[PDB]
Write a protein that binds this ligand. Sequence first.
Ligand SMILES: Cc1ccc(C)c(Cc2nn(C(C)(C)C)c3ncnc(N)c23)c1
Ligand SMILES: C[C@]12CCC(=O)C[C@@H]1CC[C@@H]1[C@@H]2CC[C@]2(C)[C@@H](O)CC[C@@H]12
Ligand SMILES: O=C(O)c1c[nH]c2ccccc12
Length: 249
Amino acid sequence: QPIFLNVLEAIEPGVVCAGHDNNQPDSFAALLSSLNELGERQLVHVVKWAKALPGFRNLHVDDQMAVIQYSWMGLMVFAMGWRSFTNVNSRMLYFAPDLVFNEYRMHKSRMYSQCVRMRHLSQEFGWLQITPQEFLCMKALLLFSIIPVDGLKNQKFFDELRMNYIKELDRIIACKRKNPTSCSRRFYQLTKLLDSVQPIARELHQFTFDLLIKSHMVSVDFPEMMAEIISVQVPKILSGKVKPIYFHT
Ligand SMILES: Cc1ccc(C)c(Cc2nn(C(C)(C)C)c3ncnc(N)c23)c1
Ligand SMILES: C[C@]12CCC(=O)C[C@@H]1CC[C@@H]1[C@@H]2CC[C@]2(C)[C@@H](O)CC[C@@H]12
Ligand SMILES: O=C(O)c1c[nH]c2ccccc12
């Protein structure tokens, strides 16, 4: 910053619609299918976003795809939680302008427990009085928060990149604090918030995987990219071959 901050703010994705038909009565098939589609559409914005981040191209072409394919879920949840807080003060999950989840939908989606956790994450944005800038940095960092236990092709470039994004988050915290104790206190809070995202993602990873398996049974449509990623990338995470990077133990 100003350089770093300018970029993140300049590349922040715009509003993405789900294409849901809010005129038809709610149903598991319709709601989940809409969530899946929204996922596809968003995945495209995430790829272009990540491929605009400072130094992202320092990563091997294969690792570039790897990081996105593993962290998309977390990235989308953290971003969904930020929208819910700013647009409806966490009252409901603001997936998209045409896809807002109230208590009833949280129930009909059959993933109420997961909606509760995500909504709790949204509430954190308010309790911790997270700023738009702190949010942007954290989200950028989420892209580099999950890798295979055996590392990537060019692991070194990844470490350097992750290290630099952590440094940037530090400057964001320092560029608005006089006390040397307030800074350390904030960083602690932010890393705690970042970690709390992984557990929520894993539960969604397990849920979507199971849904994909019995998709044909429950009449739930899965976009092309979503189906491929969930049947090839997600399993690696659920089997322990790929794991998130926690700040705290
Ligand atoms: C070769 C290359 C160059 C840049 C990026 C971001 C990637 C990862 C990447 N690309 N794509 C397509 C092109 C199918 C939309 C992806 N779709 C889903 N997940 C991905 N990680 C990616 C790959
Ligand atoms: C990432 C999405 C879609 C993008 C968003 O705003 C967050 C939201 C979180 C729940 C995901 C959904 C995509 C489709 C999934 C993966 C369903 O299959 C089950 C959980 C859904
Ligand atoms: O700030 C970042 O994210 C950076 C990634 N690669 C770099 C090289 C020099 C300075 C900052 C960065």
